[PDB]
C-alpha cells in the first residue's frame, strides 16, 4: 500500500536530479568540481614551470600554448633554458604533460561558455580550438568534443592528476598574489589541500554521474515470498543510490570548504574581466555556483526521510 506514493517520490526525485539544472544538487556539485578545477588552474598557472627534458637536455625549443592565463600574456610558453634540466616529480613538467593538460583545460573552458547541459542529456557537442606554436611551427585544431559531465570530469581528473603526480616547482618573484615567494616552491607543499580537495570533488562528482546514470535507466512503475521480493530490492537499490547522491553532493560543498581554509581562500573566487589580466585569480565564477549548490542541498534535504522510508519498508519485506 505505502509503495505507490513512495515510488512516485523515488521517481520524481530522479527526474529532478537528472533533467533539472537550477535546483539540482547533482548538477551543481558536478559544475562546482569543473569550475574549481578551472579556478585552480587560473590561479596557479602563470607560475608552474614546464619544460624539462625527457630524453636529453636542450635550451633551444619552446612551446607556446595559446589561451592560457600567463602573466602579461594570454598564452603560457614552456621554457627553453629550463629544458636543460630533467623533467620529473618535484621539478618541472615535460612539454608533453603540459600539452596534455592544456588540452583538457581548453575543452572544459569551451564547454562552459556553451555551458554544461543536464545529466540526462549526453548528446550535446562542443567545438574547441587548440593553438600551439613552437619557437616557426604552429598548429591549430578545431575538433568536436562531447559536452557532458561524464567527460568533462575526466578532463578535470586529467588536470589535477598532472599536478599531484608531478608536483612541479613554481617560479620566484624577482602586483603578485601573496603565496608567491622570492624562491621556488614545491606546488604540492603550497597547494596540497587544494589539490586534495578538488581531486576529492571531481572524484565525488563522478559517482554522482554514475549513480544518476543507473538511476535514470531504472524507473520503477501480493503474498509471502511471492516474487515481489524483486521490485523491493529494486526499490531499495534506487533509494540507497539516491541517498548516495545527496550525500556526495553535500560532500562536494564540504570538500570545497577545505579550500576556504587554505592559501587560495580568497583568490579562487575573484576576478578582473581568458585574457591578459586573468592570471592569479580563479576567474571561473565559482561563488555563484557554490551558493547554488548549498541551496540545492538544502532544498532537496526534505526528501531525505521519504528516501530512508523506502529503505526501511524494503528491508522489512526481507
Amino acid at each position: 500500500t505505502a509503495i505507490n506514493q513512495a515510488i512516485g517520490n523515488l521517481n520524481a526525485n530522479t527526474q529532478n536530479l537528472i533533467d533539472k539544472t537550477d535546483n539540482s544538487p547533482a548538477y551543481q556539485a558536478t559544475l562546482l568540481a569543473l569550475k574549481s578545477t578551472v579556478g585552480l588552474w587560473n590561479s596557479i598557472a602563470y607560475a608552474v614551470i614546464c619544460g624539462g627534458y625527457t630524453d636529453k637536455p636542450n635550451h633551444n625549443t619552446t612551446e607556446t600554448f595559446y589561451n592560457q592565463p600567463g602573466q602579461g600574456s594570454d598564452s603560457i610558453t614552456c621554457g627553453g633554458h629550463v629544458g636543460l634540466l630533467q623533467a620529473g616529480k618535484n621539478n618541472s613538467l615535460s612539454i608533453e604533460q603540459f600539452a596534455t593538460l592544456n588540452k583538457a583545460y581548453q575543452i572544459i573552458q569551451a564547454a562552459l561558455k556553451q555551458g554544461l547541459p543536464a545529466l540526462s542529456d549526453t548528446k550535446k557537442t562542443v567545438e574547441v580550438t587548440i593553438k600551439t606554436a613552437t619557437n616557426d611551427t604552429t598548429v591549430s585544431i578545431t575538433d568536436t568534443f562531447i559536452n557532458d559531465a561524464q567527460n568533462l570530469l575526466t578532463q578535470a581528473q586529467t588536470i589535477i592528476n598532472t599536478l599531484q603526480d608531478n608536483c612541479p616547482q613554481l617560479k620566484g618573484k624577482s602586483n603578485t598574489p601573496s603565496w608567491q615567494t622570492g624562491a621556488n616552491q614545491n606546488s604540492c607543499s603550497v597547494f596540497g589541500t587544494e589539490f586534495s580537495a578538488i581531486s576529492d570533488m571531481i572524484s565525488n562528482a563522478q559517482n554522482i554521474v554514475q549513480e544518476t546514470q543507473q538511476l535514470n535507466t531504472t524507473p520503477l512503475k501480493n503474498l509471502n515470498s511471492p516474487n515481489s521480493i524483486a521490485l523491493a530490492q529494486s526499490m531499495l537499490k534506487n533509494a540507497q543510490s539516491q541517498a548516495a547522491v545527496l550525500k556526495l553532493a553535500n560532500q562536494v560543498g564540504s570538500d570545497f570548504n577545505r579550500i576556504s581554509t587554505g592559501v587560495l581562500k580568497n583568490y579562487i573566487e575573484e576576478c578582473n574581466a581568458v585574457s591578459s589580466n586573468t592570471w592569479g585569480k580563479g576567474c571561473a565564477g565559482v561563488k555563484q555556483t557554490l551558493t547554488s549548490l548549498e541551496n540545492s542541498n538544502a532544498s532537496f534535504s526534505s526528501q531525505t526521510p521519504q528516501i530512508n522510508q523506502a529503505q526501511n519498508l524494503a528491508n522489512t519485506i526481507v
Binding site: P57, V82, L84, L85, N90, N91, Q169, K173, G182, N184
Partner: protein
C-alpha cells in the same frame, strides 16, 4: 657578476682540479655544467635541480666529476681530454639565466 675560477688554474695529470663559482645568485631554480665555451645540450656534464636536490649527469659526463650545492664542481683523476673550457649555466628562481665560463689546463 657571475664568475668562475679554476683551482689549480694548471692541473697535473692523474691528479685533480676544482672549479669554484663566485656571485652565485641567492635564489636559484637550478644550474648546469658544460664542456665548452657555451651552453649546449649535448655537451652537459651535469644538471642540479633545487626542487629535487638531485644531480642527473648529461651526455658529456665522465663519471669523475662531482658537483656541490654552491654550484662548484670537481673533477678527479683528470685526463688529457679533460683540459679545455668549461661553462656554467645558472637559472634563477624567476627563471632569469646566467652563464659564466672558465678553463683549466692539464699537463702530463
Amino acid at each position: 657578476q657571475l664568475t668562475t675560477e679554476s683551482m689549480p688554474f694548471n692541473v697535473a695529470e692523474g691528479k685533480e682540479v676544482l672549479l669554484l663559482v663566485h656571485n652565485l645568485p641567492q635564489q636559484l631554480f637550478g644550474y648546469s655544467w658544460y664542456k665548452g665555451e657555451r651552453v649546449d645540450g649535448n655537451r652537459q656534464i651535469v644538471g642540479y635541480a633545487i626542487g629535487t636536490q638531485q644531480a642527473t649527469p648529461g651526455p658529456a659526463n665522465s663519471g669523475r666529476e662531482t658537483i656541490y650545492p654552491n654550484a662548484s664542481l670537481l673533477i678527479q683523476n683528470v685526463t688529457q681530454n679533460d683540459t679545455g673550457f668549461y661553462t656554467l649555466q645558472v637559472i634563477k628562481s624567476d627563471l632569469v639565466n646566467e652563464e659564466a665560463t672558465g678553463q683549466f689546463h692539464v699537463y702530463p
